[PDB]
Design a protein around this ligand. Structure first.
Ligand SMILES: Cc1nc(N)nc(-n2c(Nc3cc[nH]n3)nc3ccccc32)n1
Length: 834
């Protein structure tokens, strides 16, 4: 009966049906609100194409993949049983057209990945993947999966001229000397509309004021999505506690009556915005208030030359350049000229006096005349700007969500993480953005897979948002289908089993002793039978099904956080490879931070594809499963730069320029594969140099930088980030390029040519990276987020500068890395190792 919910609660990691932490019914209203858009999408999606989830793109095939193709021909090896045959196919051949040569379906060898539907084969991501790494395309003549397995179980305010007023009854803290006062804010966005304070009373375990705090704003002037933000400072001032309350609720009603709100502690931050109260009734500070103002909010239905240039200059500025009163007044008065420029929209809607009813009304009349916005080519950066912490207005936000509707599934996957994170900026649990994510996930198994893990990542470690996210996740699981529900169940079981082991093993050490290795092998063997399922989807690569542990190859690593090095057999017999699936299980790193950085790395890779560049980044899979815990895709055949330095020189900082180049030579079997490895490195190094510099994570110790035995360099472990260095371009990296100290080479000139083009290619997307960077810091970096933290990326991307000025600017950073040489790395050695 209700047993289905218990399953969902184990899948979610939180109990949606609990009501111990609500002062209203918004969450329950949202659950019931989402039934329709779920069922709507469940009824509309193509049952066949949903079962096989073809992963396709419409992006043009890049230059680097054309100049690799030969005579307009690619070979596809189709498999029967033991023997296989190879067929001549043109890039334009639809999977339906490949029937004639050989109803059945073409499933990729060793993966739950299908080549079906009305798209040319060049447009399938797996096909594009094989061409990049120079791999043969292997497929099987299989029977299309049954849609029955995906089957789903059947499921007036403006007539009110009164001033707003809040009765502060008092604060209550079960356990704690100075004085304390309460601050009440009417908020819209990050903007404080109206502020009133109490008097500083002695900070005891119970403090009562019983005061009426009358605001200057009127009830009619309160906009939808306005927060009463209640805060506690002590006294010399320092913030101690905060809590928020929506003044206009989910049913357009003015909030009314008695409230006792348990509050959040301290240590811009997305957590400061939440409508959730602290679930910890027993230990947290509370506050008691009264609102008493049946009141519902209604709904709605040439310039001089010198000024135009002032307007254009304002519109032209970056998203972090703040607006003065003068700028705002300009934007608002020329409302209609600003409306003609989509790029003006963030700035224009930040010039709105939201605490003024008639202005908001005019703004809404203004939104009804948005032909130019509706016709413009979708700009994600611009769209993302309207979904950040500076916009609390649903109608403003919904025109951003409108633009997201035209994104194809491939592009949704690119931005999905940060779209999920942007739910944290929504005033209300039921939003256009929450609904958009829900329907994109139910429309497609791959988006749906990742939507699950992203939401689950936050539910597991965010008291501030778990409730909202839990509701969306439940809404998702009730329409994804029995097949996936079973998939998710398997996966959840496996990782909750392996996390226990990770944490148990961590306890046993205070280096790796002889018996810890057997203790691990003992506990893994315990699981291999009862009760670990022998086949589960790899969360960061839903195309792979892992099978049995390779227990001989599993280890604990020589690091003070003692992570697990697990290896699995592939559960797919059709798998032509022999490779084990390698996953690191780790506690102690904030792998949320790794997720956000890795996702931006993917965006940079997609940016570079628009300009026919491939910089060979390895943005390894990574899933944060909980608080300072998660999994890491093992990149095979790889080792850290430091360990390469240790295995020749030893435990000293006397680093030798030659080692890396003669490490690569001994791993290359031919001279053909050596220069392939050298080239792959030149690109790799340049890819990471630029990407890390832009992000402010360039100065790293070199055992947090790795290389594969085929040249591919890649940074790892992105959690928590004398003189410095813009990035890591050490003399050993330079020796591979053929240069030494102060020279040039055919490979170094290439490296600069790649850097410059890559750097300027990101600069073409300045705004987008800026917004994703700001969002990242606010939603995933609880350590920091000051205004100055976010402003770093303006400098790094040299906003306002011409191309050549910025071209040189980077060439300088490269030159700085040569000037510094080993100094920074040597300092790091004295710092971390000693
Ligand atoms: C992506 C990747 N592939 C491989 N093979 N190995 C690692 N690796 C990581 N990964 C991460 C990622 C985030 N934190 N740590 N730590 C390591 C320590 C010593 C040797 C290898 C390590 N990472």
């Amino acid at each position: 009966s209700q047993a289905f919910q218990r399953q969902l609660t184990a899948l979610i990691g939180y109990d949606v049906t609990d009501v111990s932490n609500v002062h209203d019914d918004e969450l329950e209203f949202t659950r019931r609100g989402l039934v329709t858009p779920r069922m709507a999408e469940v009824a509309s999606r193509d049952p066949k194409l949903y079962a096989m989830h073809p992963w396709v793109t419409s992006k043009p095939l890049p230059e680097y993949l054309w100049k690799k193709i030969a005579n307009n021909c690619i070979f596809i090896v189709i498999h029967r049983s033991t023997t296989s045959q190879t067929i001549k196919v043109s890039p334009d051949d639809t999977p339906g057209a490949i029937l004639q040569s050989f109803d059945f379906v073409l499933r990729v060898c060793g993966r739950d990945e299908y080549l079906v539907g009305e798209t040319p084969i060049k447009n399938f991501q797996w096909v594009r993947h094989c061409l990049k790494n120079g791999e043969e395309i292997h497929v099987v003549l299989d029977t299309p999966p049954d849609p029955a397995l995906d089957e789903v179980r059947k499921e007036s305010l403006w007539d009110c001229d009164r001033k707003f007023r809040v009765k502060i009854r008092g604060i209550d803290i079960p356990v704690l000397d100075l004085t304390v006062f309460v601050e009440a804010n009417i908020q819209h966005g990050q903007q404080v509309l109206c502020q009133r304070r109490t008097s500083p009373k002695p900070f005891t375990e119970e403090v009562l004021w019983n005061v009426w705090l009358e605001f200057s704003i009127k009830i009619k002037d309160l906009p939808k999505g306005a927060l009463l933000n209640l805060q506690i400072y002590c006294g010399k001032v320092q913030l101690l506690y905060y809590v928020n309350l929506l003044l206009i609720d989910h049913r357009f009603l003015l909030r009314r009556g008695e409230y006792v709100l348990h509050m959040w502690q301290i240590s811009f931050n997305a957590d400061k915005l939440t409508s959730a109260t602290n679930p910890d009734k027993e230990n947290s500070m509370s506050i008691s208030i009264l609102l008493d103002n049946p009141i519902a909010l209604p709904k709605h239905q040439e310039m001089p030359n010198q000024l135009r240039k002032q307007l254009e200059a304002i519109i032209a500025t970056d998203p972090l350049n703040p607006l003065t009163a003068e700028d705002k007044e300009l934007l608002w008065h020329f409302r209609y000229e600003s409306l003609k420029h989509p790029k003006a929209y963030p700035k224009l809607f930040s010039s709105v006096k939201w605490g003024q009813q008639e202005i908001v009304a005019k703004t809404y009349q203004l939104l009804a005349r948005r032909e130019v916005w509706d016709q413009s080519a979708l700009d994600v950066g611009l769209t993302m700007q309207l979904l950040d912490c500076n916009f609390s207005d649903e109608n403003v936000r919904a025109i951003a969500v409108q633009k997201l509707e035209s994104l194809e599934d491939d592009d949704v996957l690119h931005y999905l993480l940060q779209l999920v994170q942007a739910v944290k900026f929504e005033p209300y649990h039921d939003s256009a953005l929450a609904r958009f994510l829900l329907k994109r996930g139910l429309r497609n198994k791959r988006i749906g897979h990742f939507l699950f893990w992203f939401l689950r990542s936050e539910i597991a470690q965010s008291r501030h948002y778990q409730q909202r996210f839990a509701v969306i996740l439940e809404a998702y699981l009730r329409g994804c289908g029995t097949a996936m529900l079973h998939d998710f169940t398997q996966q959840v079981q496996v990782i909750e089993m392996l996390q226990k082991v990770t944490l148990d093993i961590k306890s046993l050490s205070a280096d790796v002793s002889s018996q810890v290795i057997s203790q691990l092998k003992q506990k893994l063997e315990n699981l291999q039978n009862s009760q670990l399922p022998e086949s589960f989807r790899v969360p960061y690569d839903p195309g792979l099904k892992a099978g049995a542990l390779a227990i001989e190859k599993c280890k604990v690593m020589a690091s003070k956080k003692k992570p697990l090095w697990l290896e699995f057999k592939c559960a797919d017999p059709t798998a032509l490879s022999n490779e084990t699936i390698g996953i690191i299980f780790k506690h102690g790193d904030d792998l949320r931070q790794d997720m956000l950085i890795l996702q931006i790395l993917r965006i940079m890779e997609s940016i570079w594809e628009t300009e026919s560049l491939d910089l060979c980044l390895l943005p390894y899979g990574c899933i944060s499963t909980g608080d300072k815990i998660g999994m890491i895709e093992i990149v095979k055949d790889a080792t850290t730069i430091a360990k390469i330095q240790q295995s020749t020189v030893g435990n000293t900082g006397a680093f030798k320029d030659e080692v890396l180049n003669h490490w690569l030579k001994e791993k290359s079997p031919t001279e053909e594969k050596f220069q392939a490895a050298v080239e792959r490195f030149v690109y790799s190094c340049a890819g990471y140099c630029v990407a890390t510099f832009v992000l402010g994570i360039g100065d790293r110790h070199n055992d947090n930088i790795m290389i594969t035995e085929t040249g591919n360099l890649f940074h790892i472990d992105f959690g928590h980030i004398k003189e410095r260095v813009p990035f890591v371009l050490t003399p050993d990296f330079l020796f591979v390029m053929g240069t030494s100290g102060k020279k040039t080479s055919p490979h170094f000139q290439k490296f600069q040519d790649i850097c410059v083009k890559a750097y300027l290619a990101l600069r073409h997307h300045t705004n987008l990276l800026i917004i994703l960077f700001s969002m990242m810091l606010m939603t995933g970096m609880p350590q920091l987020t000051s205004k100055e933290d976010i402003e770093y990326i303006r400098d790094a991307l040299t906003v306002g500068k011409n191309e050549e000025d910025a071209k040189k600017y980077f060439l300088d950073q490269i030159e700085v890395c040569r000037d510094k040489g080993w100094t920074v790395q040597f300092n790091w050695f004295l710092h971390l190792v000693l």
